Design a protein around this ligand. Structure first.
Ligand SMILES: CCCCCCC(C)(C)c1cc(O)c2c(c1)OC(C)(C)[C@@H]1CC=C(C(=O)O)C[C@@H]21
Ligand SMILES: CCCCCCC(C)(C)c1cc(O)c2c(c1)OC(C)(C)[C@@H]1CC=C(C(=O)O)C[C@@H]21
Length: 270
């Protein structure tokens, strides 16, 4: 079993590296001083925000129609394209989790519907420190306090993720850890409406075994870490429930929103 749980762990890490362009290790190097790379552009207020476009070569430019909208909404709408990119990254990773692709295709949809955001906030942590977050493959850094300064209820979106990220990062996980962790989250057989719970649980039992050992070998100086991570898995579900609640408020209180259709599909019946 042991050499095979290491094989599964390595196979996952390899896909993880293949799937997600920006690793925690890289993000961490940029966040600390510790890279040759030029340091990112800091967006710390409205003025630096406007300079963003000139300084960062990022992948979504706002079209003519959407240019007259208020900054909160533009920021709100801008960021959706990254989530979309995340969604397929996550899908590419899912496809490589040994046994996932052989599930009922509807169950494939359901685990993805429920995991994408748990995984996004997990991975978002890696990009965070107490001051703000890396944006555009780490070419930029938006301050936590700037995001917070946005008018209600837009200044309320990121705080709870930052609240999560500060604590989660204190566990000092790395990419190997996170590769298995991400895997255990997707293959969760307790998601509403699943068709065949058992084949999912069988995979997850295997991933959890790999996680436990991986944390054993990789974290000498912290008893109870594996349990803390299970509690995180739960913590994450509440972040998203908070997050869909706030999204509902946006829908009912704001006039010129544009919720991206792929995201709308994921959010639909959570
Ligand atoms: C009120 C909603 C806040 C959500 C923002 C979350 C946060 C700070 C990780 C963020 C993510 C983003 O993708 C952006 C981003 C911020 O800011 C820009 C300027 C919109 C950025 C532009 C294009 C972007 C790019 O091409 O890199 C990304 C986009
Ligand atoms: C296109 C196949 C049928 C669409 C229905 C499925 C639904 C609504 C989840 C959806 C899936 C999509 O892939 C898109 C999508 C919506 O909306 C966009 C804006 C077309 C999106 C753009 C590029 C996309 C991207 O960046 O990957 C995806 C594309």
């Amino acid at each position: 079993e042991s050499a095979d749980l290491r094989a599964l762990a390595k196979h996952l890490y390899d896909s993880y590296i293949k799937s997600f362009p920006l690793t925690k290790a890289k993000a961490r190097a940029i966040l600390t001083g510790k890279t040759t790379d030029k340091s990112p552009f800091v967006i710390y207020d409205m003025n630096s925000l406007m300079m963003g476009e000139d300084k960062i070569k990022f992948k979504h430019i706002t079209p003519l129609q959407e240019q007259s909208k208020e900054v909160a909404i533009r920021i709100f709408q801008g960021c959706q394209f990254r989530s979309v990119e995340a969604v397929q990254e996550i899908t590419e990773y899912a496809k490589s989790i040994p046994g996932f692709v052989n599930l009922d295709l509807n169950d494939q949809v359901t685990l993805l519907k429920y995991g994408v955001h748990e995984i996004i906030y997990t991975m978002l942590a890696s990009l965070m420190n107490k001051d703000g977050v890396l944006i555009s493959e780490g070419q930029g850094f938006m301050t936590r306090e700037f995001l917070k300064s946005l008018r209600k209820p837009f200044g309320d979106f990121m705080e709870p993720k930052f609240e999560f990220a500060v604590k989660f990062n204190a566990l000092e996980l790395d990419d190997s850890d996170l590769a298995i962790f991400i895997a255990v989250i997707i293959l969760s057989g307790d998601r509403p409406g699943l068709l065949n719970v058992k084949p999912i649980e069988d995979i997850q039992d295997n991933l959890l075994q790999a996680l436990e050992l991986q944390l054993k070998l990789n974290h000498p100086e912290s008893s109870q870490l594996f349990a803390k991570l299970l509690q995180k898995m739960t913590d994450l579900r509440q972040i998203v429930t908070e997050h869909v609640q706030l999204l509902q408020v946006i829908k009912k209180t704001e006039t010129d929103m544009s919720l991206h259709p792929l995201l709308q599909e994921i959010y639909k019946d959570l």
